[PDB]
RNA sequence: AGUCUCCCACCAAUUCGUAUGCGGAAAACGUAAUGAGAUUUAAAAAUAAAUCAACUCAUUAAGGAGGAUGCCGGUAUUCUGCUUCUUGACCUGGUACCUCUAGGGUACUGGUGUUCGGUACUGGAUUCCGAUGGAAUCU
């Protein structure tokens, strides 16, 4: 969990790169967190 | 006529009135459905697509994609003579009566180019008779005594029973529950389809398909561009892959003229006739693999003998795997 | 013993952290766009920990080289999709935790890579 | 408009293989018939609590054949048969077998002893190899 490895990984890139947000046709919303319910 | 294909018991109970397409369980999660003409077909997806449809499927030159439609709802009737003589000449009369005198001519029979027009309903059996237009039709001739007809579902039965007035002389197969079809539109259409198809042997009709999948403006191609061959189970690839096409980029207008002379007639007919026979396409399923055994076969590729390749697609067996006939 | 037996007790921690994080929040993130890489990463880790789970080295085939292409062919994707969750802005703990985990995995995978040169085939 | 559900990757089967009154891919979804209850209750606050309506809950597989109640062979109603079929709980003890490398896998047969599975793909450009294949570089 050391940022040294993160710096080593980013060494295969620029200093401080910027990434775009997802295109709007590839986004999803979070569903519920509890298990599904059966019909009675 | 033929009934609904047997399948899962739970989901075959709901098809008492409106049938299902092969992909219905997939489309239902991503579209708005309706119910007409005995089918549960798809109307429109769940996003606004007015401009994207135009600039990816219209006649523009800004296309960088394609549109695919599951048109399995259009029926298929395979009519063929039974006089045992390849000259036929009675199916010719039926097709010339069914439509106007169009779909039985030197352009459509011998050159076997596709036909699109209007289909009537003749009733000449006692004195006074007439005709009334019904709708569009797709008639394709093969070996001068076999015909394939594609019709909108609504006019499927009315014409069909007409042919049944002469089943003493012809034979008909309501194969609408055994043959499926897909329609592709756009510029980069054949490029995407060719990224998910390989062959079993070496065939010239795949060489032409490989070469013509690099046009991007399909209006230049001539009237006839039929392809027909035998593919392998597309689940082997595990990912779509290009045809290494970037090497050759000097296609001109002189090789196109070769496509009108170097036409593989016999190699198309032989692979085509494995669709107009029920037992042939029954053998086509001879050993269809489950997902887990394909997974195990792929896993067996981490200990191959070349040891300097690192391949991903599984190999192909000579006789212990099925071959899928395919027409475009 | 330092060539091995000092890295394996670190993958033995990484796999447990990944498994806990997986079992924690499957339900509410199923349809997202980064399990298509998260489960691939977890499976590649599992296929590596399972080998060499004893008194000697039972290694007939040293070809897990083929299973160490998770650091040339399919490692840019996992790095470039675990930062999109950071950019989008609705969950930020997940992005940082995933990036730290990916850094740990890449470092350990090379640490296993260079120290072995028995690819004389 | 919201402190709410479901869908937007696949599965011939460690994945809801779920024929369950009817519709639906699914839903903290819709709707039909019979019948019954409200802190003294399956349950709400200490929806209803004269009637009808409203809230909640319980029961009810499709098709087709046979006989009868009613009215002109028929339909609405009522009781009795038939057809629909992919060797499928988990854990575990035995025998036989296997092209698997003393251990694994498969057949026949015994024991009550809240989220976890497998498989998979980045967009674009340039380059290299006697090819429906393989390899390297940049962005």
Curated annotation (Swiss-Prot), chain B:
Subcellular locations according to the entry: Cytoplasm; Nucleus
Coiled-coil spans in chain: none
TM stretches of this protein: none
Modified residues (Phosphothreonine): 305
Domain of life according to the entry: Eukaryota
Extra information: Present with 846 molecules/cell in log phase SD medium.
Assembly description: Component of nuclear RNase P and RNase MRP complexes. RNase P consists of an RNA moiety and at least 9 protein subunits including POP1, POP3, POP4, POP5, POP6, POP7, POP8, RPP1 and RPR2. RNase MRP complex consists of an RNA moiety and at least 10 protein subunits including POP1, POP3, POP4, POP5, POP6, POP7, POP8, RMP1, RPP1 and SNM1, many of which are shared with the RNase P complex.
Biological role stated in the UniProt entry: Required for processing of 5.8S rRNA (short form) at site A3 and for 5' and 3' processing of pre-tRNA.
Protein name listed in UniProt: Ribonucleases P/MRP protein subunit POP1
Species per Swiss-Prot/TrEMBL record: Saccharomyces cerevisiae (strain ATCC 204508 / S288c) (Baker's yeast)
Region of the whole protein represented: 220 to 547 of 875
From Swiss-Prot, chain C:
Localization annotation: Membrane; Cytoplasm; Nucleus
Biological process annotations from GO: maturation of 5.8S rRNA; maturation of 5.8S rRNA from tricistronic rRNA transcript (SSU-rRNA, 5.8S rRNA, LSU-rRNA); nuclear-transcribed mRNA catabolic process, RNase MRP-dependent
Keyword line: Cytoplasm, Membrane, Nucleus, rRNA processing, Transmembrane, Transmembrane helix
Nucleus listed as a keyword: yes
Residues annotated as transmembrane: 79-101
Membrane topology of the entry: Single-pass membrane protein
A single GO cellular-component term on record: nucleolus
Single GO term (MF): rRNA primary transcript binding
Superkingdom as given in the UniProt entry: Eukaryota
Main location: membrane
Functional summary from the UniProt entry: Functions as part of ribonuclease MRP (RNase MRP), which is involved in rRNA processing in mitochondria.
Additional free-text comment from the UniProt record: Present with 556 molecules/cell in log phase SD medium.
Complex and partners: Component of RNase MRP complex which consists of an RNA moiety and at least 10 protein subunits including POP1, POP3, POP4, POP5, POP6, POP7, POP8, RMP1, RPP1 and SNM1, many of which are shared with the RNase P complex.
Designated name of the protein: Ribonuclease MRP protein subunit RMP1
Protein's organism: Saccharomyces cerevisiae (strain ATCC 204508 / S288c) (Baker's yeast)
Residues of the full protein shown: 1 to 128 of 201
């Amino acid at each position: 969990k050391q940022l040294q490895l993160a710096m080593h990984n980013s060494k295969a890139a620029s200093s401080t790169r910027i990434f775009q947000a997802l295109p709007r046709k590839l986004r999803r919303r979070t569903a519920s967190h509890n298990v599904r319910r059966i019909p009675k | 006529l033929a009934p609904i294909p047997k399948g899962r018991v739970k989901y075959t109970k709901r098809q008492k009135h409106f049938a299902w397409l092969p992909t219905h369980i997939w489309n239902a999660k991503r579209s708005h459905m309706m119910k007409r003409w005995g089918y549960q077909m798809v109307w429109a997806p769940t996003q606004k697509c007015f401009k994207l449809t135009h600039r990816l499927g219209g006649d523009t030159c800004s296309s960088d994609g394609a549109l695919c439609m599951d048109s399995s709802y259009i029926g298929t009737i395979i009519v063929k003579d039974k006089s045992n003589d390849s000259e036929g000449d009675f199916l010719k009369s039926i097709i010339g009566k069914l439509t106007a005198e169009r779909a039985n001519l030197r352009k459509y029979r011998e050159g076997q180019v596709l036909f699109q027009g209007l289909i009537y309903s003749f009733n000449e059996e006692n004195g006074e008779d007439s005709t009334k237009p019904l709708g569009p039709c797709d008639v394709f001739w093969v070996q001068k005594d076999t015909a394939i007809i594609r019709l909108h579902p609504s006019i499927y039965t009315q014409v069909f029973n007409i042919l049944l007035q002469h089943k003493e002389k012809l034979t008909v197969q309501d194969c609408r529950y055994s043959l499926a079809s897909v329609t592709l539109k756009g510029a980069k259409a054949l490029e995407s389809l060719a990224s998910c198809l390989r062959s079993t042997e070496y065939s010239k009709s795949f060489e032409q398909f490989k070469m013509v999948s690099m046009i991007t403006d399909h209006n230049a191609l001539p009237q006839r561009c039929t392809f027909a061959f035998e593919a392998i189970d597309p689940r082997h690839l595990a990912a779509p892959k290009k045809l290494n096409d970037s090497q050759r980029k000097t296609v001109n207008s002189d090789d196109i003229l070769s496509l009108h002379e170097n036409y593989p007639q016999d190699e198309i007919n032989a692979v085509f006739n494995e669709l107009c026979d029920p037992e042939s396409r029954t053998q086509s399923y001879n050993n269809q693999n489950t997902l887990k055994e394909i997974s195990a076969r792929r896993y067996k590729l981490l200990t191959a003998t070349p040891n300097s390749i690192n391949k991903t697609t599984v190999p192909f067996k000579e006789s212990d795997d099925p071959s899928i006939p395919l027409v475009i | 013993m330092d060539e091995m037996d000092n890295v394996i007790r670190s993958l033995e921690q990484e796999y447990r952290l990944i498994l806990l994080l997986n079992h924690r929040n499957k339900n509410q993130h199923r349809a997202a766009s980064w399990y298509g890489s998260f489960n691939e990463m977890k499976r590649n880790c599992g296929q590596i920990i399972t080998l060499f789970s004893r008194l000697k080295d039972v290694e007939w085939v040293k070809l897990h080289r083929l299973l160490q292409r998770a650091l040339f062919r399919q490692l840019k994707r996992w790095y470039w999709q675990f930062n999109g969750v950071i950019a989008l802005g609705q969950f930020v703990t997940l992005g940082c935790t995933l990036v730290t985990l990916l850094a740990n995995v890449r470092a350990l995978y090379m640490r296993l890579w260079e120290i072995n040169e028995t690819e004389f085939i």
